[PDB]
Amino acid sequence: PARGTLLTSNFLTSYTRDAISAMLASEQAKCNVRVAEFTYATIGVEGEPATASGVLLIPGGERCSGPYPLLGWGHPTEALRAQEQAKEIRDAKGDDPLVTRLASQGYVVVGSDYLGLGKSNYAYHPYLHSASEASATIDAMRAARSVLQHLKTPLSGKVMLSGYSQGGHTAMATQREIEAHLSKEFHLVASAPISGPYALEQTFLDSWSGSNAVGENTFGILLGSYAIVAMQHTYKNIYLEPGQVFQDPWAAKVEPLFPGKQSLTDMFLNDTLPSIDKVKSYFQPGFYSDFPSNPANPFRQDLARNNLLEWAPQTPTLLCGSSNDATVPLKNAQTAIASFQQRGSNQVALVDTGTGNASDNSAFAHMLTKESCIVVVRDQLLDKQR
Template structure:
């Protein structure tokens, strides 16, 4: 790994000094040679999936992982592997295909009982509004992660992108729920993970899995669509597990426009609405001329700086940067609320353009969620199942409702209860598909 990074740094230094060196030679030939070399080096440095930086943060020994599981070991399963945690910065593309960088957490299994070739999981995280949030750094601080215990310690390599505009990405904004850039960030994280694993001599089986929760459910489904459409020869996709995602994105916003749905009030509604509007404005440029066109005072003055910004979504609400979730009328201008009735309204069209139900999956898909989810209605999962199986796809649905106590509210169903249950249920099915 060190040799790979030293080579890259040397290449970047060469780019910096190339013109000065060539100026000492004969003018025309030297200039042509410099341009050709610089072009080739730049193309290599910013080829999609190129590894720009690797930081190895920690190695977790199998015995320590097992000790940390305690009573959870019966549900998660005993670990077989040591796990190395790294943060990777890699080259990808922005929403218009322009060069960009993103970061990802990489978990690589190892150890004496874990020498077999490993499957590679592309993980897509849920909604994150904290601009500098890095899954690798957060895992290091916590000393634990479901991705570490459920997957990596059981022999699956994990590449978990932080997406564009979050973590160590240089992108100027996070294109929240923009399907194509979610997918490209995942695809390029998989490419970067393969390169790092190869340099570290960690064998991969060639089989790829995809999974994600909430926004990550949307992103992992988008990645499956993109891989099967554009990269089928590059990735052997063994199975996917989108969980609790807004796959029917436009309909999800229509049904939740009042911030209350069949499962009760959505305590995150104001933050999710604001994030989506700001992101779609930054992607498409036609949602509003000024934040005041959408957001009431005083929120119009600050909403853009928190989407993303210094706070996670819970602190945005807890600290009063936005009204409480169900109080959407305090946030949204009446005119914008009325305009949403028009299917041709720019925000409606942006949402519809990022729906994910107009294709047919080829790899087996396991969908997981909970019927009492008040944040992302389970209707998304049922619609995906109905439409995909109607076109001949192999899709299984797992509803965790009967395993969640009745007293758990609809927001907590989404943000905590269903997460853990879906992790376990889909992990076992994905590994059965891959092995």
């Protein structure tokens, strides 16, 4: 099947505007929100045929007529292979910012579960791989449009992009790809990456010790390990066997974990992998010291290929994050904007949702930027570009 071909489609549930307003009251929803799930044809990292799943949020109601803008969404790090966004939203009774803050305000939201997750046939998940993060997202939007055409849902034709954490990386990766090769098919009017590692290589370097200028990179063992295993599957240039990078007993468990039968929270709460303070006993000495002192290091080269700095964004873009974030330093956005401007682009701006107090600096501030940034971005950029 051609990229973007719809394979299966189906409605899961529905939330009335009043039901959503009730949740928010825990300000007011304008739309009822229907949740649908689908699977579609896309490509692998080598351009080979593959499949993936995704979620589709459809707004509707009297004070919520279309034509609706199409918002492509990038979800955060997911280590549980079987996780499907559509079903998680359903299990949470619609209590998710995608429903309560975006679809509820008239934005058709589409998000891919990514290659290797949900109903995808892929053997692994290309974590932080720009090319397939973009391809999976683009093809999800393509399949979603077919679903919407069948439902006769009126679309304005204007497209937007957003995402949180790893999702911010995929949002920008998708923006870059659309701008370079698919702008006629996707009329991009706004992009709002949230707390993403755009300066991917720099982010790993700055937090390699376990801490950065902001604070302790508490979730680093898990996220860093996911990236290494994924880059190995994608580029196959890091190691012949896990033990060359990871010390025992971790070496034997890392690959089956990313992705696997455990969620990132499961791993963190049960210490399937050691805490950040035990980083030196986690990674093999040679690899641990080689990574930062050798730009030719294979893992480093793989991260470099996935940086999103050397290009000139054309779409109005608002990078959001928190200055208190120690997981993904806001430095990322600063570095990104500096690169873009040097390249002749002044389409990108940034908004800081931090407190300004360093005492609030924490790895956990990362999670607080999801909803906070979604609202700010919606109000300051998306609504104006609709």
